[PDB]
Design a protein around this ligand. Structure first.
Ligand SMILES: O=C(O)c1cnc2ccccc2c1O
Length: 437
């Protein structure tokens, strides 16, 4: 297949639903390359667990942990890594209030070349055990011969765009990784990078990040079709930020507007949001503890009950993962009958202004609080007008593997969105327990 989009292995489904999946031990295996060093960008780390996922022969190679922790959290992470002399840390600057470093990425430097992995899992046991998570695997990028002058650039501009993302950190340990990338040929890359970095962007920088970056790519590299207003937008996420008192404040004004862009020309488009219900979480493989990774607070939720009429249940029979709660985040544009899609995005970005950006200063400035990263699949980058949706995720190799069921199913009248900081004591979970925060 040309897409190299994978799900993580799930303990407890039948072998047929893990055949095409990847565990972290598979990604770091010597079959993927002879490791010289690596960088792990993430949010949450269990360093003891992480080192055990590298092959024994590679466990002393240098590792850089890129994180956003401060003060006592930062002290804790340093204490976790100190036992391992080969581990260095890079604290991503977070100069805007309430920002987070959410990007999940591996840079893997080999004897044989370089690989980039952009994914959705934290580096802790539970994120790779029974959740639905997404992975994009780059090709093996060869080194450019010393003395040769070539760009090593792809038609999607991936090499320059990844360097730009890393340069935004202004960090010495990542300048070294920038120099590594400069030395490699990334021309085979067929995805576009979509990142978020913290800051306030105007003018020439407005289109660099967040939902304006998505808008720009859709304007430049996708085509509008007749009856485009009938092609829905689907967003699928594991948490929700404060979006405002009604849909006109951000969700349907600037976010949806970016997401419905197609082509260069100048809304009734249906918007489906997929987010686990309480019943989804209760009957999941993990039980209520899955809700520890779906951090929608009651304080936020009670100010935006209007939003929940957009919510659709998690259902993933296509990949055997209806009971594996989602920590993947995806956004896509299906056709009215859900048989095709105009594009697909897998990312760390949840449904929040912090991640995607919010316009300020009379519409002239895009303010982002967080680091996020994802990759965008556009048919034009594969010589196509659209992607056909693969009917079974693990079953004409140009069909795109959507990991959950279409069409999405609306919440029933008795369903409620999972809200993590209130109790659920009406019915027990798959392990026999209630939820008492
Ligand atoms: O992976 C992330 O981006 C993330 C960030 N904050 C989180 C906060 C609470 C529970 C899970 C979280 C999470 O899974």
């Amino acid at each position: 297949n040309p897409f190299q989009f994978y799900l993580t292995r799930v303990s407890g489904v039948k072998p047929k639903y893990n055949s095409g999946a990847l565990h972290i031990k598979d990604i770091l295996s010597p079959l993927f390359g002879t490791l010289v060093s690596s960088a792990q960008f993430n949010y949450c780390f269990d360093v003891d667990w992480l080192v055990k996922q590298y092959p024994p022969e590679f466990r002393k190679k240098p590792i850089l942990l890129v994180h956003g922790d401060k003060r006592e959290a930062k002290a804790h992470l340093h204490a976790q890594a100190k036992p391992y002399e080969n581990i260095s840390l890079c604290q991503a600057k977070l100069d805007i209030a309430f920002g987070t470093h959410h990007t999940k990425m591996m840079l893997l430097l080999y004897e044989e070349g370089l690989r980039v992995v952009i994914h959705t899992s934290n580096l802790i046991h539970a994120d790779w055990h029974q959740k639905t998570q997404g992975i994009w695997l780059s090709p093996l990028y060869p080194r450019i011969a010393d003395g040769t002058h070539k760009s090593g650039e792809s038609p999607t501009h991936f090499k320059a765009d990844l360097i730009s993302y890393l340069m935004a950190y202004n960090a010495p340990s990542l300048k070294e990784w920038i120099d590594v990338i400069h030395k490699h040929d990334l021309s085979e890359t067929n995805v576009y990078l979509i990142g978020s970095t913290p800051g306030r962007f105007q003018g020439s920088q407005k289109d660099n990040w967040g939902h304006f970056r998505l808008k720009k790519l859709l304007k430049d590299h996708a085509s509008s079709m007749p009856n485009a207003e009938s092609w829905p937008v689907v967003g699928q996420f594991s948490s929700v930020g404060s979006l405002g008192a009604d849909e006109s404040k951000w969700l349907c004004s600037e976010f949806k507007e970016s997401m419905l862009t197609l082509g260069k020309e100048s809304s009734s488009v249906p918007l489906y949001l997929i987010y686990p219900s309480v019943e989804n979480v209760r009957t999941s493989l993990e039980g209520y503890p899955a809700g520890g990774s779906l951090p929608y607070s009651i304080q936020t939720a009670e100010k935006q009950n209007w939003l929940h009429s957009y919510f659709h249940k998690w259902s993933a029979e296509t990949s055997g993962r209806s009971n594996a709660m989602p920590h993947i985040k995806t956004y896509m544009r299906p056709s009215p009958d859900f048989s095709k899609i105009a594009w697909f995005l897998v990312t760390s970005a949840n449904l929040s202004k912090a991640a995607w950006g919010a316009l300020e200063k009379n519409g002239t400035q895009l303010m982002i609080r967080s680091y996020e990263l994802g990759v965008l699949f556009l048919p034009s980058a594969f010589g196509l007008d659209s992607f056909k949706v693969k009917q079974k995720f693990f079953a004409p190799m140009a069909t795109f593997p959507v990991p959950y069921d279409l069409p999405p199913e609306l919440y029933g009248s008795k369903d409620r969105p999972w809200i993590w900081n209130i109790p659920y004591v009406k019915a027990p979970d798959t392990h026999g327990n209630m939820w008492v925060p």
